[PDB]
Subunit: 301 residues, 2 copies
Amino acid sequence: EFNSDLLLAHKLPETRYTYNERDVAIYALGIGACGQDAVDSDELKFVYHRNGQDLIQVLPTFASLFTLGSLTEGLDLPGFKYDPSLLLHGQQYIEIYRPLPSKASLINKVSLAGLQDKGKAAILELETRSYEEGSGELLCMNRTTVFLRGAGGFSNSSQPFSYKNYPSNQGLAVKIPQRQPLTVCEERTQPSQALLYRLSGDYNPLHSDPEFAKLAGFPRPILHGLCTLGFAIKAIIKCVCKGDPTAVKTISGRFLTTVFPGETLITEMWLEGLRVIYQTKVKERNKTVLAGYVDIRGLSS
Amino acid sequence: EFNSDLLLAHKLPETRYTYNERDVAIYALGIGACGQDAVDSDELKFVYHRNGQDLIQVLPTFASLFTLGSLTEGLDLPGFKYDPSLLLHGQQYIEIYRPLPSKASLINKVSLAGLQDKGKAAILELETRSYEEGSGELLCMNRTTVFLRGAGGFSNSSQPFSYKNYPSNQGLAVKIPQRQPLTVCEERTQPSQALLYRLSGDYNPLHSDPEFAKLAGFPRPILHGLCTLGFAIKAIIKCVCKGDPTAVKTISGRFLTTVFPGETLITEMWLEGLRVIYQTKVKERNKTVLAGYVDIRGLSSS
C-alpha cells in the first residue's frame, strides 16, 4: 500500500501559530536566561527591557516552537504509518532569515523533506516554513529529523526507499576539530528545568512524569532535547557572538544522549571561519549529549 | 560619511515581476534548449507541449531573471556610492524551494547580503527573495555578487569593512576533484545567442554592440554570464538529472573568463554525494569560463 508517487505528491496542511512577548520571556527562562546572574547584562535583555517587554530580544532557538504538534499528534501520510510513542528526535536544523519579533502571527507551511527506509526504522524529515502574517516575509525555516522506530520495511530490500528533497550538506555532521576549544562555557540547569521549559509548548510526560519515564527506561524524567539545544546556542551567542542573538544564521543540533534536569551542561566551541562547531557534555556523567554547528554573520565592526 | 549601522538598517524597496509561458520558452531557447536537435525528447519539454504551452517546464536558471534591474539602475545605499558602468558580475547563487510555475506574478523582496571594501574595488552582494502573489510562498532566492571597480576605500583602510549576512558556505568555491569527470557534455552556442538571450531582459550593450564592447575591452560582444550558466545547468539537468529540472535545488556559478557567442561550451561534471561539481570551458580557446556546483534532490525511486 506504499506508493512513492502518492507520498511525494501529498500536500500537508498549513498551520497558524501565535505568540507574544510573555511567551518569549517564558521560553528564555525555560532555556536558562539569567540562570546564574539576575543582572547579567548579556542575558537580561532576553527577559526584560526598561521600555517594555515588547522590546526584549528573541533567542533564535525559539523558532523551534513553530514545529510543535505535527509528528507526535499523528500526521497521516499516504501509504506510510508509524507509532508516535517510539519516535526519537534525531536532529534539529534551523535557518533564521530575519530577526524574530517579540510577538507575531505565523502561517507555517509544512512539507515532507525526507524519508528513508532504514530496515527496522524509518527516518522522516519535516520542513516548516514560518511566514509572518502581516509582512508575508519568511522569518525562518525548521527541519526536524525523527527516527521512527518500528516504521521501517515499507519498501523493497533490493532498493530501500531514500528521499532527500533539500541540499544535503545542511545538518551534515561536522567533525570536532583536533585542537583545543576556542571557548568553553559551563552552565547548570535547574532541577525544575523541564517543568518550566514544557510550559513553552511540549507537554510530553517523558520530561515531567516519574512513572512514565521509568517505563521508558529512565530513573527520573529527562530534559527536552530542544531545551539542551537552547542552552548551547545561548552559550554560543554569549561566548562567540558578543551577546548579539541576531548573529545566528543557522543552527544544527544533533542529539546524542539524554540530559537530566539539574545537571551541568558544558559547551565547547570552535571557530572555523564563520561557522561555530560545538559540542555539549553533561559534566556529572561526562557524556556528550549534543553536537552541531552554527553559521554566524560576518561583520568587521 | 560612511557608517556601518545606518547602512545595515537600510531597507531596499520591493519590486514586482510578471512572466508567462512565452517568456519561459524564449528564455529556454536563449540558453540553448533544442539547439542541436528539434526532436530531442529531453529538451523539447522546455519549449513545447502537446496539451498547451502553459504545461512546458521551466529551467531553474530562469529564476536569475527575477533580479534584473537592481544593481544596474543605481540603488542608493547610505554612505556608499558606486559607478554602475564599472560593475562586473562575479558570481550567481540560486536556491529553488519549489518548482517554478510556467506563469507567475512575483513580489521580490530585496536585501543587502554582503559588502566588502577590497581596496580600490568593493564587493557587493544583493539578495532577492521571490514570493508568488497568490500563495505567498517563497519560490526561490537569488544572491548576486558584483565587483564594483572604483568603489573601494569607503571605510577606514586601517580595518577594511567586511559584512556577510548569510551562511558563508553558500556559493563557496569548491575544488575540482583530481579524478576524471563523471560526464562531459558539449554544445555549440549560436552566433546570435546573446541577441536572443537579451530578449529575456538584460539589454546591456556589452552583449550586442560591437563598438560598445570594444570600449569595455573586448574584440566582439560577449555572451551574458547568466546565459553561460543556463547552458551549464541545462547540461547537468540532461546528463546527471535524467532530464528532470525539478531535481535542482541549489545553483552556484562563479564567472571566470569571457565567452563569445558562437563558441562551443564544454561542461565537465563530478558527483560528490548529492552535490554535482562542475566546470565549463570554451573548446576553441581552451579556457575555463565558469565553475560552481549544483545540489540535487536525492530520490532512490528514480
